[PDB]
Amino acid sequence: GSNADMEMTLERAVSMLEADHMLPSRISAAATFIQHECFQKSEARKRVNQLRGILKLLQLLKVQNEDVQRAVCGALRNLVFEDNDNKLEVAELNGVPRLLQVLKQTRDLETKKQITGLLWNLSSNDKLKNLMITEALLTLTENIIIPFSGWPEGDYPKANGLLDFDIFYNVTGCLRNMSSAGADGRKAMRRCDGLIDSLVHYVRGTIADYQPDDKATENCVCILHNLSYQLEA
């Protein structure tokens, strides 16, 4: 192992996530190592779980440094990819509200893409769909979908300089998965003010603007099939 050297391994990286030093370079070197190792290795995602690294990373979301937040959110997105134990552990540790706080506060677009991709990975686990509605439906609708959509047209809303297509796309993937929840979950989404109207508007704007292959529109259509019904009184 390490004997006074800096050869990086998963074990050294998790060891460098001590909560109290707040040294951006140390956290960034350790969390980017985990990000890179978990990009294509399922075994690395399991190993970080075994080494208790998921909570250590979530604790460092408190660090107000853009490099740290990119490393930590990038790491966490790669850790939960196709790993159900890790998705469940992020949810169980109250990772969703903390991640949403960073998503609202950061001024870095790439950090928003990482967080929104991470949440999208969580949302494909069937056991997490209702939890994601409880924890994330309102923040995702009001912070991303509504402002990026351009709805309502007739109110000429300003553009949002801290959103882009990739962030909107991720969030539509999130919501698409969430809209396959059961009836009580779908009712909450249907009744979330402005969600349906904004998705409809986005879809129609991409038709008028000749973007027939827009992948966010595909997600919007699916969300709307799942949600756009009412029960007779």
Swiss-Prot record:
Induction of the gene: (Microbial infection) mRNA levels increase in response to P.gingivalis challenge while protein expression decreases, suggesting proteasomal degradation in response to P.gingivalis infection of gingival epithelial cells.
Membrane spanning stretches: none
Chain positions of ARM repeats: 3-40, 42-81, 84-116, 184-229
Origin superkingdom: Eukaryota
Tissue specificity of this protein: Expressed at intercalated disks in the heart (at protein level). Expressed in gingival epithelial, endothelial and fibroblast cells (at protein level). Faintly expressed in tracheal epithelial cells (at protein level). Widely expressed. Found at desmosomal plaques in simple and stratified epithelia and in non-epithelial tissues such as myocardium and lymph node follicles. In most stratified epithelia found in the desmosomes of the basal cell layer and seems to be absent from suprabasal strata.
Cellular localization per UniProt: Nucleus; Cell junction, Desmosome; Cell junction; Cytoplasm
Family the entry assigns: Belongs to the beta-catenin family.
Function: A component of desmosome cell-cell junctions which are required for positive regulation of cellular adhesion. Regulates focal adhesion turnover resulting in changes in focal adhesion size, cell adhesion and cell spreading, potentially via transcriptional modulation of beta-integrins. Required to maintain gingival epithelial barrier function. Important component of the desmosome that is also required for localization of desmosome component proteins such as DSC2, DSG2 and JUP to the desmosome cell-cell junction.
Pathological association: Arrhythmogenic right ventricular dysplasia, familial, 9: A congenital heart disease characterized by infiltration of adipose and fibrous tissue into the right ventricle and loss of myocardial cells, resulting in ventricular and supraventricular arrhythmias.
Subunit: Interacts with DSC2. Interacts with JUP. Interacts with KRT5/CK5, KRT8/CK8, KRT14/CK14, KRT18/CK18 and VIM. Interacts (via N-terminus) with MARK3/C-TAK1. Interacts with DSP. Interacts with DSG1, DSG2 and DSG3. Interacts (via N-terminus) with CTNNB1. Interacts with CDH1. Interacts with the RNA polymerase III (Pol III) complex proteins POLR3A/RPC155, POLR3F/RPC39 and POLR3C/RPC82. Interacts with CTNNA3. Interacts (via N-terminus) with SCN5A/Nav1.5. Interacts with ANK3/ANKG and GJA1/CX43. (Microbial infection) Interacts (via N-terminus) with influenza A virus RNA polymerase subunit PB1 (via C-terminus); the interaction competitively inhibits the interaction between the subunits PB1 and PB2.
Record protein name field: Plakophilin-2
Native organism taxonomy: Eukaryota, Metazoa, Chordata, Craniata, Vertebrata
